[PDB]
């Protein structure tokens, strides 16, 4: 129960209760996604219709976001009604209904919609494949529920009792008086949540290299390389991601996307090259892997990536505060490779 807030002289506050309860900590495949879609449903006291129709007249909305690690319960509001939203997030964490007619009518159709939308995009399919073959049972769990194993209502109640525990979450209010926030989080149900253990492990996530997966897909064709990185090597792959995204690289015209996902014990640098026909993807990713195995000078992208890191980092509540100063050179070692789409014309891992 770590309460933090950064005050400001503005009109809109945001509250965020972050649990360490995303797909990485899911016991079955997709329990985290179903709990996230079960977040702002009706409680034991206040319904879900009364929640929306009161919070609109007070002037703020809610949003539950599922991450690869967290579950963020965010609430945006006009500043002078903070205890309502503190008590509403408290009621959601402490007493949700978990009704079976709520599982069949709201949570399962919303999750099926999320899964259909993220199924239609081969970049998210390849990102999930790259996760699931870099790390296997940890972060390489599926992000979304698809129904390949039966997640029942009792499993969501069990996962919520495991995850919604008092030492597992953190309360963070952008533009909130912090002393008032600490007074309002106490005298509420965040202090009556169970003080369970924190699910954050402090060890390394036991990655795997040289793996290759191939998914057939009707539509666009992407090919993706992915490197699991550790805590000492986070800044280098950060300046690499902003180098290949930036206009300093000669490979930015070929690369569709390149991003590093950072965690408190490691990260995954994912590079996607996406096009309509597989010959362009083949030529592009052969050039990418060749000119990355040949070394790159990541020294020019340093002041640019300080800017882009501050841009990305002002939104989040937990900065990692990377170094960016000792980073000079990069040379591509081993890497994991997925190919999605016209999979008989995208190259294999030997040909790269």
């Amino acid at each position: 129960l770590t309460v933090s807030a950064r005050d400001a002289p503005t009109k809109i506050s945001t509250l965020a209760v972050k649990v360490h309860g995303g797909s990485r900590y899911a016991t079955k495949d997709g329990v985290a996604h179903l709990l996230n879609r079960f977040n702002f449903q009706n409680t034991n006291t206040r319904s879900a219709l009364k929640l929306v129709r009161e919070s609109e007249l007070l002037g703020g909305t809610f949003k539950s976001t599922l991450d690869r690690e967290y579950i963020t319960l965010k609430a945006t509001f006009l500043k002078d009604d903070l205890p309502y939203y503190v008590n509403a997030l408290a009621d959601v964490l402490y007493k949700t209904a978990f009704k079976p007619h709520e599982l069949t009518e709201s949570v399962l159709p919303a999750a099926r919609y999320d899964y259909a939308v993220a199924e239609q995009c081969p970049v998210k399919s390849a990102e999930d494949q790259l996760y699931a073959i870099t790390f296997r049972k940890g972060l390489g769990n599926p992000l979304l529920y698809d129904g390949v194993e039966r997640v029942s209502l009792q499993d969501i109640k069990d996962f919520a009792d495991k995850v919604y525990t008092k030492e597992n979450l953190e309360v963070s209010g952008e533009n909130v008086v912090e002393a008032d926030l600490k007074r309002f989080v106490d005298e509420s149900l965040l202090s009556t949540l169970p003080a369970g253990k924190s699910l954050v492990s402090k060890s390394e996530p036991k990655f795997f290299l040289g793996e290759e997966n191939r998914v057939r897909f009707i539509g666009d064709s992407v090919a993706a390389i992915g490197i699991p990185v550790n805590k000492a090597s986070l800044a280098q792959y950060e300046v690499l991601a902003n180098y290949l995204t930036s206009a300093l690289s000669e490979l930015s015209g070929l690369i569709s996307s390149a991003k590093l996902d950072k965690f408190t014990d490691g990260g995954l640098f994912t590079l996607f090259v996406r096009d309509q026909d597989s010959a362009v993807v083949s030529s592009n990713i052969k050039k990418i892997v060749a000119d990355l195995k040949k070394g790159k000078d990541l020294s020019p992208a340093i002041n640019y990536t300080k800017l882009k890191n501050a841009v990305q980092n002002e939104s989040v509540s937990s900065p990692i505060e990377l170094n960016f100063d000792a980073v000079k050179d990069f040379k591509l070692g081993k890497f994991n490779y997925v190919a999605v789409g016209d999979v008989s014309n995208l190259p294999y891992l030997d040909e790269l």
């Binding site: 319904s47 219709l49 009364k50 129709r53 007249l57 079976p100 007619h101």
Partner: protein, 126 residues
């Protein structure tokens, strides 16, 4: 047309009072025995007319084993009253078997619809 929450309110008031219970409960038990729906194999929550969205909501929210059993009791009562007989005396619904199984689902859908109407017609105190 009479809301089920109102029937629950009046019946709970009768049952929680010791005089009204011992005065009106045997009248209702003899009324139910004279009503004769148990001789056709029906419990009472098969008899509620379902052609309204609260009852359609509760019947959608019924679990599947109660749904299949209710379907069999309704089809059996239709065939029994078609043949102009009753069920045999071991096929009558016993008194301890006549439990309100649809009633929490009806009362919950009724409370949800009443809260939805009350929030549709609010007046914010300004």
């Amino acid at each position: 047309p009479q809301s089920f929450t109102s029937i629950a309110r009046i019946g709970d008031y009768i049952l929680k009072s010791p005089v009204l219970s011992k005065l009106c409960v045997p009248v209702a038990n003899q009324f139910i025995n004279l009503a004769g729906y148990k001789k056709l194999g029906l419990k009472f929550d098969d008899l509620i007319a379902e052609e309204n969205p609260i009852m359609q909501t509760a019947l959608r929210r019924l679990p599947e084993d109660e749904s299949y059993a209710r379907a069999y009791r309704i089809i059996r009562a239709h065939q029994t009253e078609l043949t102009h007989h009753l069920l045999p005396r071991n096929e009558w619904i016993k008194a301890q078997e006549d439990v309100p199984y649809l009633l929490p689902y009806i009362l919950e859908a009724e409370a949800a619809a009443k809260e939805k109407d009350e929030l549709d017609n609010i007046e914010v105190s300004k």
